[PDB]
């Protein structure tokens, strides 16, 4: 809720970045192989931005990716259902 759905998004967004590097390192070709850009990648995923920077190539990397979508889109379908109430409440008051 308040900052609770928020926090869970960030657990996912770290572990998602961490496991991404672990799964993708070893597949010849992968771009998702340093912990920085792996983190940016999990945001580009939780938020459905689809910019096209990074993406996984290994099977397990795609599994990590799916979890980020589910657990992120859900968090963000609730962080953004929450940022939308208090600021509209603030300016509607």
């Amino acid at each position, epitope marked *: 809720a308040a900052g609770a759905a928020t926090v869970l998004l960030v657990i996912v967004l770290l572990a998602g970045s*961490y496991l991404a*590097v*672990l799964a993708e390192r*070893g*597949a010849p070709g*992968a*771009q998702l192989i*340093t*912990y*920085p850009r792996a983190l940016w990648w999990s945001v580009e995923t939780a938020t459905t931005v689809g910019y096209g920077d990074l993406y996984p190539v290994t099977l397990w990397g795609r599994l990590v990716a799916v979890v980020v979508m589910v657990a992120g889109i859900t968090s963000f379908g609730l962080v953004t259902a929450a940022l939308a109430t208090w600021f509209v409440g603030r300016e509607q008051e």
Partner: antibody
Amino acid sequence: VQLQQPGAELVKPGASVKLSCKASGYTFTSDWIHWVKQRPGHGLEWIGEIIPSYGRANYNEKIQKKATLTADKSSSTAFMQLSSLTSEDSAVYYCARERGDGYFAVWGAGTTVTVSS
Amino acid sequence: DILLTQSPAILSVSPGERVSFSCRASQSIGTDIHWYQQRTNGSPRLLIKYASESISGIPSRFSGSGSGTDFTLSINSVESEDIANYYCQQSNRWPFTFGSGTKLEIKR
């Protein structure tokens, strides 16, 4: 000295050998330990990486996979097992500390391996 | 497996002058190149990271240039202590790779 590896080994042809790299300083969860090989008068040949904490290792696709990587999670020392060597396998072997951001900040002194009888 | 190609192989120069080693990649890697110096008998040593950013404890002679498939290590001046081999290394796609290397000679 951060990364710290022995000076020189001597292996009979066909025999195995284990190589060490004890690393003071920090011992982060996310740290990776790489191994690079320098045949005399040659460039730098990446061999493979290992994240010690978690435990996985990935080797160089292209070279004849002779070796295997291991680590000791609460000794801060990592290992590399070269198995059944020729004289093509004689070189200097460095370990490197990649933080997870893509460059080898820290290098060991290098271990010189000479495969002869 | 990405190909880093350092032309030329050797580099002659007179002391105090500027000097630039080219590295050229077999496909775009943005800025994820890094430069290493390796003197005679010594281990390699990071010089520039991410193709432009400098390392703390490196002489201000060294300057990182380039992006894309063309990169450039440069030394704004030269003196006798910079004689060594020089290597690049991409970190943009697995596996990490290295360059062929360039050695620096000084006409004195």
